[PDB]
Design a protein around this ligand. Structure first.
Ligand code: FAD
Ligand code: FAD
Ligand code: CL
Ligand code: CL
Lengths: 417, 410
């Protein structure tokens, strides 16, 4: 599976999107340069959830063992009432998720980044301290803040929620905007939890726990043997750990204990964007991936999934390029394959903002009832207990989708050019 | 309360008998229970009590007592025999409380005592009273001593080897080991402690055999091992030998068993009728729908049987209505119990598959919680049908729709 025509591909951004794109495109014969503005690389000190649609790909790419060594395999997702901790919903993870062909893991962002870096490294010329400030959309070329011109055949903006390349693609200022929500992000020692009989079960029976309250919710889960991840969503108004404790003072007693263990916290503002009208610059030499085109509320835990899926689709499509005339149509095929899914996913995250943050009242009572009975789509419910939603999200195979597309459509539409 | 107060003879003081005595007594009928044993009580074993049952116990005012002694399991977990690999999960806990009452694990004796407390003020219990013959016309039950006991109606709650069933009908390969082990021994082993600390119904499935196990009290873990009966206190040695191929955690659990009850399981096709044609004798519980215990609903069906009898017989005002009421009882109960017996049969097959295509397909169905060859308790429809059922509501619905005008015409 190699491309007849080898491109020089410029990837702006060395987050997880960038890494995965460098691996996926490099391994099919393309030359890859990654231009990163920061003078270091790595992920922040926090947990991430990786669903089967992602871990299917990690397994396929030969890093399943590394994932398995560091990551935690939760048994279930448990939703609880803020004041008491009363369980109002369960969605089975574990073998219920493995039925889609790979596990549902909880992992430290740094461990995941390091694993992706191990795949990308031989495929990418990484340039750090390289801030793209302009683009020649015709050639194309990426122009650094120093004035250095970097020539290639194609530019991928994997440059995140403050993407410059999004601005290039749309030909004007354009941004993800604040949502009115922020999170505190914290890791605490599992050792402190194991020492308390009420908190030990949260370590010894790994689950994704969600406490839902008026305008606020907490998600918490083990991410390494020594570390438990906590994320607290709350109204953004503009003693960091102190203000967090204060903001969640009405949550149940076990929550108060967990928060008493937090020494410090990242404050993080949550951005969101309406879906873009296009991911392709009209001249057909620049496109986007990851948060640069589908930044979403994190309440569906699929943003990195979508970035990595985006990369996997690019890899499959661009293994088939044999002529420069096919480049622009391939970018539109990428957009066609990815825009609807990512937009739906952004949508489900927005639905969960509402569901998770309901004030006490009729809606909240109905939500809790739906969650107890695991209501099926055949202030709403537990998406992860819905078999159809699970099939659509977690049963998806990015590589298979793009190959199916090539066979059915791409071959006859692009394949002769 | 009933306009016409009957004298009702109940043969058997197992759980069916007790529930019938309570349900019939409280609506005005006089009740005599004839039990052949000179004591009453239950065997040393666990039972699972589903929402269809615990809804009724709650309604009858013993919910707090039940809650005090019961364990509330989180889930039901099915595992492969060789490895212990989890191949299926069905959520219990709040998933089951969505049907209006909890799914409990409880010691048979604790449940029996609670039923006894309900029935006791309503019944005259006669122990050492073995019914050996019946006058189906009068009717009367005649004891082994020759004493004749008169009443208006006889209910056979006299178990799997019911004599009254033989009266009513007018004509003449699996076993389990049952054990309890101390939770202390499990708590002491880091591999086994989770089974105590996270209460589940665990089922290990293998060729021709399966094990079910669950906590029933603070100190006690219930274990039941189904296996081919080649045809009673059993040998714990033979049990261990029969399950020597099961996963190492199971070997540990069985190494803790000091003794075992050996118990033969009988499965019966549904009866053609539960009413003697003269309309003075009927059946309840294992006396009419003894099933393989693989669906954990035998006592549920007996208690439901009783609850429907109570509702129907609150309405009797004339002796002419008695026979039609027994047929109404049968009409309301026979199809559900037969379906239930059927689900237990289907589980025999599912649980006992040899390794092969079927077993692989079963495991796939169980992982994904297919909505047979799967985990019935993870199926929403089957759950609604079995556990969402309210015996008293069904019978009142029936009264409103049909019974008032149909039994009104006697
Ligand atoms: C609280 C929270 C929880 C989340 N939980 C989950 C979850 O459980 N599961 C999940 O799948 N996703 C999750 N996500 C989403 C996930 O974090 C992101 O979608 C993903 O990390 C985005 O990766 P990316 O590579 O597109 O962007 P980024 O990680 O933003 O990387 C972009 C990179 O581009 C560089 N760059 C920017 N501009 C320039 C420029 N002009 N020149 C050069 N380089 C530039 C940046 O410096 C950065 O290194 C979560 C997000 C949040 C905030
Ligand atoms: C291994 C196993 C596990 C089970 N697990 C479950 C479970 O999880 N959930 C569930 O709901 N059910 C379960 N069951 C089923 C349940 O135990 C039975 O369905 C129920 O106990 C039957 O009650 P009964 O009162 O109809 O009959 P029995 O309990 O058999 O009582 C009949 C009584 O009548 C007496 N008697 C008999 N003949 C006469 C006579 N001629 N005169 C007077 N008295 C007489 C007997 O001595 C006895 O006392 C299980 C059964 C088994 C074997
Ligand atoms: Cl996300
Ligand atoms: Cl049973």
């Amino acid at each position: 599976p190699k491309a007849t025509l080898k491109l020089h591909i410029l990837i702006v951004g060395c987050g997880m999107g960038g890494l995965a794109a460098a691996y996926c495109l490099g391994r099919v014969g393309h030359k890859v340069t990654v231009l990163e503005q920061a003078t270091t690389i790595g992920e922040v000190g926090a947990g991430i959830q990786i669903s089967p649609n992602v871990s299917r790909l990690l397994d396929r790419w030969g890093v399943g063992e590394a994932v398995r060594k560091v990551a935690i395999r939760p048994e279930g997702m448990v939703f609880r009432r803020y004041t008491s901790g009363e369980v109002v919903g369960y969605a089975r993870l574990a073998e219920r998720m493995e039925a889609f062909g790979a596990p549902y893991y909880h992992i430290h962002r740094a461990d995941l980044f390091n694993i992706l870096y191990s795949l990308a490294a031989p495929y990418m010329t990484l340039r750090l301290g390289a801030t793209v400030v302009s683009v020649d959309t015709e050639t194309p070329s990426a122009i650094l803040a120093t004035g250095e011109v970097v020539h290639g055949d194609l530019i991928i903006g994997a440059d995140g929620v403050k993407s410059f390349i999004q601005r290039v693609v749309l030909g004007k200022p354009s941004s993800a905007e604040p949502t009115g929500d922020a999170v505190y992000r914290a890791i605490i020692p599992t050792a402190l939890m194991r020492a308390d009989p009420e908190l030990r079960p949260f370590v010894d029976t790994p689950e994704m726990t969600g406490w839902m309250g008026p305008q606020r919710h907490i998600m918490a889960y083990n991410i390494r043997a020594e570390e438990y991840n906590i994320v607290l969503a709350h109204p953004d108004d503009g003693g960091s750990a102190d203000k967090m404790r204060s903001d969640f003072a009405d949550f149940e007693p076990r929550v108060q204990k967990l928060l008493s263990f937090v020494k410090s916290t990242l404050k993080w503002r949550l951005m969101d964007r309406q879906p873009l009208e296009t991911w392709v610059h009209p001249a057909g030499r620049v496109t986007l991936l990851g948060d640069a085109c589908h930044a979403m509320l994190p309440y569906r835990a699929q943003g990195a999934a979508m970035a990595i899926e985006d990369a996997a689709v690019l890899g499959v499509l661009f293994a088939h390029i044999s002529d420069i005339a096919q480049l622009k149509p391939l970018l539109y095929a990428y957009e066609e394959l990815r825009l609807p899914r990512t937009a739906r996913t952004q949508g489900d995250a927005r639905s969960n903002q509402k569901t998770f943050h309901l004030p006490d009242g009729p809606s909240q009572q109905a939500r809790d009832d739906n969650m107890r009975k695991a209501a099926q789509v055949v202030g709403n419910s537990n998406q992860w207990a819905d078999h159809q939603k699970n099939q659509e999200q977690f049963g998806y195979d990015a590589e298979a989708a793009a190959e199916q597309w090539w066979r059915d459509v791409g071959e006859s539409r692009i394949g002769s050019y």
